[PDB]
Antibody, heavy 220, light 213 residues
Framework: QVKLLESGPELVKPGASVKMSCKASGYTFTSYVMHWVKQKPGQGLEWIGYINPYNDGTKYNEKFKGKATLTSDKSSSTAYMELSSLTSEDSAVYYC?????????????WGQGTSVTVSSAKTTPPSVYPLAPGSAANSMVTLGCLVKGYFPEPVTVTWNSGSLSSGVHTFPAVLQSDLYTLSSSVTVPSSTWPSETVTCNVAHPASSTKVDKKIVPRDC | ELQMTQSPASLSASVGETVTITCRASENIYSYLAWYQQKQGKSPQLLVYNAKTLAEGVPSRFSGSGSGTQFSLKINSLQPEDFGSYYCQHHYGTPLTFGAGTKLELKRADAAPTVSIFPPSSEQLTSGGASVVCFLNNFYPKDINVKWKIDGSERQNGVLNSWTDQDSKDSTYSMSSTLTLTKDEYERHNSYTCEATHKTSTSPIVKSFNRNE
């Protein structure tokens, strides 16, 4: 096998609409209902509605009445969900989910999810700032990298091009005034820094930017 | 709408231990109750349907019980692959609704966070902004409180926190707290402190620096 091929991530402005799809393969499309479920980052699951591809019957969560429209095309075994009048509240991951053969309201095969991001922000490369300890700050030392004010997600952060990985902590980005900011820390033996070089490598494919910043001791 | 009340919201346990998650429906849903597991960064997977029937591939250590308004999912002798989130969902009629979820995490020995504070980089300052960053890494249990003090007084506005979920290798948690100010704002104050309150210490862990020192 069963496979649900979902459409790519969506980045759209408030007030716009998006139509996502899920092409099913590995089973007979019309023999199962297709549900759609919304999940915001770190939050729970909310059922949007379902369509029965066999007879086009639909049922919608009243909470999504007017915002979601479900359709399907038997010829291409594809189910679609269109969301309208989008606001940032609609930013989330949306899953097309196959209902079970007999218990069709039980969700037995969940797709990978299509990420929808609703924002008025424009592509913005990150500002990358190296974080060295204050002049005043024993066996280990922690260094950091602040990746601030970029859009859209994601960015990839590595240390010494990946050679440093075990002592790395890269945190989920947070949204502030329409732009994302994240930080990453790396912990290494004090005997290795500053005697040896430690570099933050940041990539932001959306703006086609790559930045390498060596972490250097503060001149104090 | 029909409401599913799931508990506990959070549960800690060790490999080999037996745990139970419960779900209450606001109406009689007979045996139309399903359970799902969702691991970090993955889509959910069906575990149980019709309140007690195991889904394809689900180990016999899992069992669902109940019929009417009270249900439970029991996992006998927890295995490492069982940690993650669990959700209930009635499948009686539309609208279909889900419980709020239960996060099942792995118990390990306590660990105090390693706290590190960083003044704004000189590069950020030339740009006009001033972010003071604090990392609180590899601690357990997950509950932690971070307070920022500027010259002896707690500061609330301008703080953004981010947390990692339980580490798949050492079972600890980490957090980053960033106090963002304007450069002007930053240059008016002297002492900056990141204070962490965690069960490993009766007193907070305090890391600080003086802008002019």
């Amino acid at each position: 096998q069963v496979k649900l091929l979902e459409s790519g991530p969506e980045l759209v402005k408030p007030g716009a609409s998006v139509k996502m799809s899920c092409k099913a393969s590995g089973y007979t499309f019309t023999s199962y209902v297709m549900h759609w479920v919304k999940q915001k980052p770190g939050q729970g699951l909310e059922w949007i509605g379902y369509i029965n591809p066999y007879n086009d019957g639909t049922k919608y969560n009243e909470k999504f009445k007017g915002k979601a429209t479900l359709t399907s095309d038997k010829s291409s075994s594809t189910a679609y969900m269109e969301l309208s009048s989008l606001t940032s509240e609609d930013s989330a991951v949306y899953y097309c989910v196959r209902g079970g053969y007999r218990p069709y309201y039980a969700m037995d095969y969940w797709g990978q999810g299509t990420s929808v991001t609703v924002s008025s922000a424009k592509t913005t490369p990150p500002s990358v700032y190296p974080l060295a300890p204050g002049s005043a700050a024993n066996s280990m030392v922690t260094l950091g990298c602040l990746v601030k004010g970029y859009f859209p997600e994601p960015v990839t952060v590595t240390w010494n091009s990946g050679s440093l990985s075990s002592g790395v902590h890269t945190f989920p980005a947070v949204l502030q005034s329409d732009l994302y900011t994240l930080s990453s820390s790396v912990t290494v033996p004090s005997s290795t820094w500053p005697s040896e070089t430690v570099t933050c490598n940041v990539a932001h494919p959306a703006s086609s930017t790559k930045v390498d910043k060596k972490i250097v001791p503060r001149d104090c | 709408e029909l409401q599913m009340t799931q508990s506990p919201a959070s549960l800690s346990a060790s490999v080999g231990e037996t745990v139970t998650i419960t779900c209450r429906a606001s109406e009689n849903i007979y045996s139309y109750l399903a359970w799902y597991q969702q691991k970090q960064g993955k889509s959910p997977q069906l575990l149980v349907y019709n309140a007690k029937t195991l889904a394809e591939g689900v180990p016999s250590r899992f069992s669902g019980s109940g019929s009417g308004t009270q249900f439970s999912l029991k996992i006998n002798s927890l295995q490492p692959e069982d940690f993650g989130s669990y959700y209930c969902q009635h499948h009686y009629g539309t609208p279909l609704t889900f419980g709020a979820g239960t996060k099942l995490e792995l118990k390990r020995a306590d660990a105090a966070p390693t706290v590190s504070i960083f003044p704004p980089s000189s590069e950020q300052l030339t740009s006009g902004g001033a972010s003071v960053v604090c990392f609180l890494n590899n601690f357990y249990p997950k509950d932690i409180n971070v307070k920022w003090k500027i010259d002896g007084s707690e500061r609330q506005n301008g703080v953004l926190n981010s947390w990692t979920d339980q580490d798949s290798k050492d079972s600890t948690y980490s957090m980053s707290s960033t106090l963002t100010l304007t450069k002007d704002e930053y240059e008016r104050h002297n002492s900056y402190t990141c204070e962490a309150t965690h069960k490993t210490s009766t007193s907070p862990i305090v890391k600080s620096f003086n802008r002019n020192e």
